Amino acid sequence: VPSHRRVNPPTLRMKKLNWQKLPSNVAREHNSMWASLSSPDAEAVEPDFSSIERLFSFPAAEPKEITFLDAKKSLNLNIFLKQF
Amino acid sequence: RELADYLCEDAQQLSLEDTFSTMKAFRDLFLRALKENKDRKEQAAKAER
Amino acid sequence: ESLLTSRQLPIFCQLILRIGNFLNYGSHTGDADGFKISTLLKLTETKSQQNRVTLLHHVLEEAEKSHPDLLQLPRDLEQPSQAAGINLEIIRSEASS
Amino acid sequence: TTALVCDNGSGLVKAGFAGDDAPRAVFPSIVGRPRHQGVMVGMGQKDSYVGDEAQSKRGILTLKYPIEHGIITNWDDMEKIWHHTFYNELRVAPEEHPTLLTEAPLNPKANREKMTQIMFETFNVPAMYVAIQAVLSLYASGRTTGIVLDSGDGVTHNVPIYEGYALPHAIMRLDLAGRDLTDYLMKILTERGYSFVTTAEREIVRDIKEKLCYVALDFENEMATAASSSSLEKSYELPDGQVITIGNERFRCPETLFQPSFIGMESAGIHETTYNSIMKCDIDIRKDLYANNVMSGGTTMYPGIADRMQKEITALAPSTMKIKIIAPPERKYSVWIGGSILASLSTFQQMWITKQEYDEAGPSIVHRKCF
Amino acid sequence: TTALVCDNGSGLVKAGFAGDDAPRAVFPSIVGRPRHQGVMVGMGQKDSYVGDEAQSKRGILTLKYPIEHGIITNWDDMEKIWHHTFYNELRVAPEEHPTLLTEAPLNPKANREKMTQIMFETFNVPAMYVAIQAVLSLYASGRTTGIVLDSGDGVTHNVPIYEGYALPHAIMRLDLAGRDLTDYLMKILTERGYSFVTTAEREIVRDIKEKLCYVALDFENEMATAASSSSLEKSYELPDGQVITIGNERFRCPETLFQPSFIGMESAGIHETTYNSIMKCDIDIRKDLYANNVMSGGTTMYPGIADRMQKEITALAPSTMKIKIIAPPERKYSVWIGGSILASLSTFQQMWITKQEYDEAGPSIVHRKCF
Amino acid sequence: TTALVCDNGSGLVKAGFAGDDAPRAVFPSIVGRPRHQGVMVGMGQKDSYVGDEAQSKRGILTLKYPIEHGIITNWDDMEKIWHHTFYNELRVAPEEHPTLLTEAPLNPKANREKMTQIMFETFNVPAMYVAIQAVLSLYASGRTTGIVLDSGDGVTHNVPIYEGYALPHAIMRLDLAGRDLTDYLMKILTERGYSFVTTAEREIVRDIKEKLCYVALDFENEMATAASSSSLEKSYELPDGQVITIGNERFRCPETLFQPSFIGMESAGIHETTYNSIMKCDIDIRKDLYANNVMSGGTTMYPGIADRMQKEITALAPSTMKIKIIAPPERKYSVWIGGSILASLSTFQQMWITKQEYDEAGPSIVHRKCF
């Protein structure tokens, strides 16, 4: 049962995850891990495709304290004043 | 030979060392992803606070 | 033995295969029955629109809520991590000598 | 908006605004924790003293230096140091002020990673930069070309620059400065009978070194003069009232900068480091490095060091060409001063690491945006 | 309208005004690009230094020569050189003054094509002319007949002219001049241990060659004198203050002109080139070319070249006919002086290449107008 | 009698007998002097350890390399090295055995003069010879034509030979090899926190470079792989029990051979050095030099260098000629092995430098007999 291949097509353009794809006949060996996944009684996790389609798709196209000094001399005066 | 058939690699070209190094890097990336997710959630909670 | 009898690693491989079959539709790489071991290293290449969240971070973010048993995955891969860097040829040659 | 300069060196944090003459908050970088049993209850017994309070109350405290040879080892202590120098000394909000930090060259990269991440996620700024201290010392000197020897409390580093161009292969780092001089002075004051073992007594030995020590012009003649007559001996008063009098340790202690084999280091002195840094450069600029030997840091504040290093380089350089040490009277704070001109420069405003660029690029922009 | 004369030779660009006796702007043809990292922000850090500024700041620069063996390899660098010699040195508008140009014989044609295209589409003059350098040297010599050996920095070429008629088949070209001498001098200085590998150090070896090297009158006897006694050895001062001493390498460097097998070339020497250039001419006109060996170029500025040239030609030629070398003291600028003589002539005004002629004929009229 | 071959390279001295296939005595060329204070009297505390004893006892020693970039800087140290390799390692009498020595091209001549004088007046052989290392490597390869790149620890030199004829003008020397790689690996290992400053730690960094480093086939893709994942990181065990792990520094360290601008040198890579050595030759022989690129030296022991060399030369050369890299598995000792080929040939026996020739001609017969 090809449960891994039964995926809906996406609405938006997706960022391509590059990988080295195996041949199919190599993947259908007797001792293969993918052969054990191909049994339908194995444990399968359903992904939430909505958030993956949401995020990984391509993007498209006041006078409180008035002073007459500058800030440097005022803060130097604050350091001078608050130590008293 | 069993792991060569298991991971669907060529038996005469499989080395166990690069296999275990790929698993080591995958575990390091796994722990770094969990740590970055925890730091991101903690900083998002602190920013919301 | 830990790689051959891992339970959560085929679960994660079917999860990334379903995500890639969603994600690489319409290309030559899609509709795959399997892939190599080096696919897990490239998972940080697929970034979000904000260049903050990679696909690995989002998969573990989804796995924290729905299927937490994937967080048991470093326990199975601890012994491959300890076994990495060990050259079998030099110790077998030393044992034979 | 005005900018902040904070030379967060190994020994003394020097922090202040931009465009100012003198650094407003100069205080040593120590975290003090109590080591005895407190029997009194009430009236605010703190578990950690940072800054001048740790200096005043040092007789019941273990003092830890969070920075060792320019590399921050303990990071919660450095978090408390930054918290004290922002909130308590300058009394400023770091969320509305840009900040220029200083860094020694040939530092481990994860140290810079953690400086960027803690500085952008605990004390989150609009902008922050990490600069080389020797470039700021050349900014303070008012000249474009020159070789800069900086010597703080942990790092003595040599960087040569010609017409705005630093040569990265000629930059040299030596982990020998005033803390190693202080530890060697603690080793050699035991010869005269005075025992200093605690971290609080390191401050007293540091005060002895700051107040009495001087760089000899000729070492062997000064040893012969101190061995012959007690004219070079000088006295100092301890906080317990005892009066000490020291002799050759006034000039044996700063001689470790010119002779690193005193503390067991294989590497050559600062004069050989300066000469090798000049000789590693291209040939046509070397004359312009001989006449512009800029000195900085508090370790070069002994009143015999300029003539001595002029003598050593003049012995090392070819004799047909002038040697001139640029030793300003305010070379203690020159890293902060050149940070204040660079923070006030109009062209520097495009070179800030903004918060948006940090969020886009992770903590990895500081390798490619800074030096 | 005063014309401009701009000898764009391989070695140094010599530009100035017509009718004058000395060129106003003599400056070397290099482009200097910085290679190290700039740290000091502001103060106009140019990305390419051209001419005298590249020479005076060469310790931080990679220097590129736009001409290699008489052929312009890099054209953007030559556009920068022409912009520098028009706008910065003479400070004249090119669109109101004619500009004469010089060129070596047996040049590939596309160099002349792109010279025509750039001087009428980027530096568009009212008129220009491209001339053979040897014809200009004979015009500055003030005689109608003679054979000119012109040796610049890339091309050593022999051209005979009799009564204003230049024989084309006897014109010879050899790709051995002053840059190859400088390359060989950097090769043979490694015997004495002085490793000159950078492009900046090539200018230092060129200054050594200009100040100290000379053509030997006999080569084996100067081996005997140099190997026997250290009387010929001369010391030189490097810009870092180091002093070198060279011995036989003073005269081993120009003997590549008289023996091209030193740098692995099958061709014969410049004296044999001159003798075969004379012998390829008619039997009637050889007598005047024996007595009028005019020489020009900076490679003819060694103080032993004329007597050696006379000795080798008198050994080669039959002894009944008179051999004479015409070596004026201003033969370095004689290409410019001949261009200034030819530009101010009244008969030259119909021989200009106009904008209208270029527009009707493409960039191909330079083959049918010039020689 | 049976001759000796003694490759006295910058890093490792390889000595052995003629007519043998493997060098009998391979040991590194260092002189170790103690720098700490000896307290236990007796038990034969030597003041200078040479060879493997300096390697085993390096934690209390200053190690000096007597050869720097193929040039012997310290001559007493190399006298100690020759005394150790004759009397202790090989256990031979040098006065009754000819000895073949190896030397890099474009060397200063006074180095060859002092080797001739010392080996005829301190280690007085019946006969000897001084040979170019590339010719010995080509004789080890069993072929007559080819271009040899030889990269030891101080010198990387390219020599092309066609039918036994070596073209001297195409020989190219570059002072970049394994010691500069070790110093650059010291400079880049400080990024990960591992401080290696002593001369003893240079051997540890060299062992890291020998055991873990490799030449990348494509540098930018390998940087992208190292930035992406930590799969190609590898761990090494220090002698104190600490385990380090290095990543991109496995291939950034040998990339300095292909990109010399990492350590500030202006020169081009070894592939461009090889290509310019080929293009300086005649046009008829280059097809023989493309197909026979012989490599030698320990700097070609990285297990990715031949494919990268073939890729870079195939990118440089025209595609209609075959690129083949001759990389035998024993090309580390091939400089020895071809010497053991050359010392045992019958036609070499008249080419020896006898003692009578040295006595009649001074130490000047080595310039006229050796190439």
Ligand SMILES: Nc1ncnc2c1ncn2[C@@H]1O[C@H](COP(=O)(O)OP(=O)(O)O)[C@@H](O)[C@H]1O
């Ligand atoms: N007047 C002085 N004379 C001699 N040494 C001094 C003097 N002032 C300070 N020092 C030494 O120099 C150091 C100050 O240099 P500085 O660059 O401020 O260090 P940091 O910035 O790492 O705290 C102190 O550790 C002190 O030991």
Ligand SMILES: Nc1ncnc2c1ncn2[C@@H]1O[C@H](COP(=O)(O)OP(=O)(O)O)[C@@H](O)[C@H]1O
């Ligand atoms: N006084 C001198 N003595 C020896 N060589 C000189 C002297 N002046 C210049 N040269 C050499 O001659 C060259 C200048 O020749 P020049 O006629 O200007 O050539 P070009 O015009 O083709 O560049 C310089 O490259 C320099 O090396």
Ligand SMILES: Nc1ncnc2c1ncn2[C@@H]1O[C@H](COP(=O)(O)OP(=O)(O)O)[C@@H](O)[C@H]1O
């Ligand atoms: N297995 C190896 N892998 C990488 N580099 C090596 C290896 N073995 C030796 N080297 C490097 O090559 C050099 C040895 O080359 P060699 O020509 O023998 O040097 P020398 O003869 O000058 O001592 C050493 O300095 C070492 O750094």
Ligand SMILES: [Mg+2]
């Ligand atoms: Mg400092």
Ligand SMILES: [Mg+2]
């Ligand atoms: Mg010229």
Ligand SMILES: [Mg+2]
């Ligand atoms: Mg070698």
